[PDB]
Design an enzyme around this catalytic site. Structure first.
Site, PDB file in Angstrom:
ATOM      1  N   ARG B 281      11.826   0.925  -5.658  1.00  0.00           N
ATOM      2  CA  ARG B 281      11.397  -0.134  -6.566  1.00  0.00           C
ATOM      3  C   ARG B 281      12.633  -0.842  -7.156  1.00  0.00           C
ATOM      4  N   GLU B 353       4.422   3.716   0.709  1.00  0.00           N
ATOM      5  CA  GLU B 353       4.117   2.362   1.152  1.00  0.00           C
ATOM      6  C   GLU B 353       5.421   1.633   1.571  1.00  0.00           C
ATOM      7  OE1 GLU B 353       2.228  -0.061  -1.856  1.00  0.00           O
ATOM      8  OE2 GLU B 353       2.408  -1.872  -0.607  1.00  0.00           O
ATOM      9  N   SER B 356       2.302  -3.989   3.433  1.00  0.00           N
ATOM     10  CA  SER B 356       0.966  -4.349   2.994  1.00  0.00           C
ATOM     11  C   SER B 356       0.542  -5.557   3.812  1.00  0.00           C
ATOM     12  CB  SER B 356       0.946  -4.635   1.495  1.00  0.00           C
ATOM     13  OG  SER B 356      -0.379  -4.647   0.996  1.00  0.00           O
TER      14      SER B 356
END
Ligand SMILES: N[C@@H](CO)C(=O)NS(=O)(=O)OC[C@H]1O[C@@H](n2ccc(=O)[nH]c2=O)[C@H](O)[C@@H]1O
Ligand SMILES: N[C@@H](CO)C(=O)NS(=O)(=O)OC[C@H]1O[C@@H](n2ccc(=O)[nH]c2=O)[C@H](O)[C@@H]1O
Ligand SMILES: [Ca+2]
Ligand SMILES: [Ca+2]
Ligand SMILES: [Ca+2]
Ligand SMILES: [Ca+2]
Ligand SMILES: [Ca+2]
Ligand SMILES: [Ca+2]
Lengths: 428, 428
Positions: B281, B353, B356
């Site tokens: 992140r 993840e 997407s």
């Protein structure tokens, strides 16, 4: 930042060198501020000593009434804080002058008022004679449907571009080739850097305080309200040079040679009317940057080495260019010595700047507190910093498209770039 | 933006579908605003007609006293302007509601409250069994001296990184490979896009009005004070999807398949405490984006195709992953259907993840006024838009370093990347 002791022992000599850049040093204001500073400094340090002494008197009397003494200490505490605040205001005033002073031009630099006084040093290659009317890169980009300025005005605003297809691929291939050349052949270490930087970094390389208006600034983030006043980088020189901020480098570890490929964000002042159409002057442009951190006695040789590295890109790509020694009046703020490489632009019937290679001397090293030391040495010294474009990628694309255009508008891919384009010979 | 006629003919049916996302549609307020709108609209159009009529009476009486008539026209002109302003305020109020409404989830989407309700669709590869204690990418980066978070805090602030040397080269090699794969094998056209975009663009893809706080905004430029309120792109989806804004595309020219490699800038809300250390992140991260502009009847097949394109990157790199169908409660604002690819992260003992892939249906096409038409057709229709990561480059680097680490900390270069690293087998 100039040596503050050199602004004390030789202010008129420093003013003489700076006048060649067309900068008028306010020697009288600097002297009047410095004299008032010595006065407030003695007054302040005397208050620091007496407050320190009176507080020690309490702590020792507490063991053996501490009320008349605690009152005096608080009165002195208020007087010292006021004197310290008055002193700090004067220091901020001296800084506003000191940090707006450009670098002293080296004796190697020819004296001149502007770019029309710059000295040509060398020329490589022969500009191509065309058998048809030369099309500019904007026309060529429209023909290929590869350079779209209208789509970028819709997405953002003016001085932005959208590159599509094979021309976008070619732009990427240019950056890939430049980075591979400098890391594989020229001894530079590759870096991925932040494209947003803080105030300290911008003061460190000289963008602040004088050139705030040439930057895109970001508003602080809600979750980082007091530590996110950032600006977009105008060049990879800003994050790369600042990697040695507050460091003592072992002299054996020098030179530190760094490269990075980044977008560059500028809102350069008074450019309105200059290069209105095309990729030459953009708010966003890619550039492969070379940065050198060296020993003070090696910076002049490093400038020749680094300029040769930028020249090699143009030579391998077969792009004719001229190497220019910038005069005192055309140099950038931080530079003490600069060479500009100017590439042949056929639709403009002239050479256009594609690279600026500078020796910054100790000007940024002073702001950053970047120093070196031999393991034996009882003393450290400021390093020298150098930076140079190898090259501005959008301007390389301008030069490539125009010099390699075919009669039908096809773009011949230069030989060195073909391995980067899967052996493709022509676009179109 | 949802179909406004569908918010009129079926408001309770639309509310039912939206409730599955955990969104409560204010059907009563929307109805009360719509009823007051029809009232002000009749009043306004009646004033527009009578002002238009009274002005025509002047122009024809001028040929054959025009003072009592010019007075009446100015009184009506003031009344109409007031009514138009009152009407516009109500329209802005309806827009604030309408533009904060997320996309209707497709019937294919499983019903769920959050990410713990997401359905696993497939799994590829076997997570590696280690003969030593797994080091995280942060430790590996420190060992190689290649990932430097401290240098980035010094340059900027938190959630930034400086990559140095071979690890920076590897990050570049990942982006080069992803772009080559999608343009050479998957039929995508490469693009160089602006990294700063305007308000129209941000409304077009749904970042505005609801997610302004998740963006880095730039202050307007002095020379462009009224046309430079920009934000940094959080994804190449924003400039790429907006390339079809206000366009009527010939259906034969569809699908439009675009790719771009860009930095991405986000200040995502409430992330404080989640992934505090490392590259997962970041405020700035590189991502190779795939965008598809397709005919309304081909968007479901295009989602499978595009997801397969992202999966291919992970498969060629030999990175084990799981493919997940996001439930109604875990989908992004614009999506009507999403698949997330989650890569094996050995130091975390879980899948994380990395991609997407979404079908946006006509939600962005409605905001952008992006339509298609067969050459015969008497009517145009809104296109469907799709976007998907192929892949997030920093997260690919996390996965690569951790899955390919050797006992001594050396990084084995995956076979497909070796041509991008001059045949290098290991870093270190
Ligand atoms: N760090 C140093 C050396 O790269 C530096 O930034 N110097 S420079 O001259 O400001 O910029 C470096 C180079 O960037 C290009 N440029 C400039 C402005 C613009 O709008 N578009 C461009 O392509 C110019 O060719 C210039 O030689
Ligand atoms: N345009 C679409 C598809 O790419 C999009 O942006 N979707 S996403 O899910 O928001 O973002 C796309 C991908 O970006 C990565 N990411 C996200 C946040 C972060 O801080 N760092 C990351 O690496 C995540 O892996 C995610 O799957
Ligand atoms: Ca050495
Ligand atoms: Ca210059
Ligand atoms: Ca400089
Ligand atoms: Ca076709
Ligand atoms: Ca998601
Ligand atoms: Ca989406």
């Amino acid at each position: 930042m100039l040596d503050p002791n050199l602004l004390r022992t030789e202010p008129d000599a420093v003013a003489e060198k700076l006048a060649r850049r067309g900068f008028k040093l306010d020697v009288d204001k600097l002297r009047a501020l410095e004299e008032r500073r010595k006065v407030l400094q003695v007054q302040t340090e005397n208050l620091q000593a007496e407050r320190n002494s009176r507080s020690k008197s309490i702590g020792q009397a507490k063991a053996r009434d501490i009320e008349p003494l605690r009152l005096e200490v608080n009165k002195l505490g208020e007087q010292l804080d006021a004197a310290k605040s008055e002193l700090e205001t004067l220091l901020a005033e001296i800084r506003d002058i000191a940090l707006a002073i450009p670098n002293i031009p080296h004796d190697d630099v020819p004296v001149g008022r502007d770019e029309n006084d710059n000295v040509e040093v060398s020329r490589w290659g022969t500009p191509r004679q065309f058998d048809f009317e030369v099309r500019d890169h904007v026309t060529l980009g429209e023909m290929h449907g590869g350079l779209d300025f209208a789509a970028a005005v819709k997405l953002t605003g003016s001085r932005f571009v959208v590159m599509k297809g094979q021309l976008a691929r070619l732009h990427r291939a240019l950056a890939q080739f430049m980075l591979d050349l400098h890391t594989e052949q020229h001894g530079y270490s590759e870096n991925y850097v932040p494209y947003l930087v803080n105030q300290d970094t911008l003061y460190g390389t000289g963008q602040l305080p004088k050139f705030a208006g040439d930057l895109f600034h970001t508003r602080p983030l809600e979750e980082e309200a007091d530590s996110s006043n950032y600006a977009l980088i105008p060049t990879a020189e800003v994050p790369l040079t600042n990697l040695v901020r507050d460091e003592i480098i072992d002299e054996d570890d020098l030179p530190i040679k760094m490269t990075a490929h980044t977008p560059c964000f500028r809102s350069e002042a008074g450019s309105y009317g200059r290069d209105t159409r095309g990729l030459i002057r953009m708010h966003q442009f890619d550039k492969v940057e070379m940065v050198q951190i060296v020993r003070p006695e090696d910076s002049m040789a490093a400038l020749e080495e680094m300029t040769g590295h930028a020249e090699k890109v143009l030579q391998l790509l077969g792009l004719p260019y001229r190497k220019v020694a910038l005069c005192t009046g055309d140099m950038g703020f931080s530079a003490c010595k600069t060479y500009d490489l100017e590439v042949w632009v056929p639709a403009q019937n002239t050479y256009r700047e594609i690279s600026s290679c500078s020796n910054v001397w100790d000007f940024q090293a002073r702001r950053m507190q970047a120093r070196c030391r031999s393991k034996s040495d009882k003393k450290t010294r400021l390093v020298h910093t150098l930076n140079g474009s190898g090259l501005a990628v959008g301007r390389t694309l301008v030069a490539l498209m125009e010099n390699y255009q075919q009669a039908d508008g096809r773009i011949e891919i230069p030989e060195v770039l073909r391995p980067y384009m899967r052996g493709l010979e022509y676009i179109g």
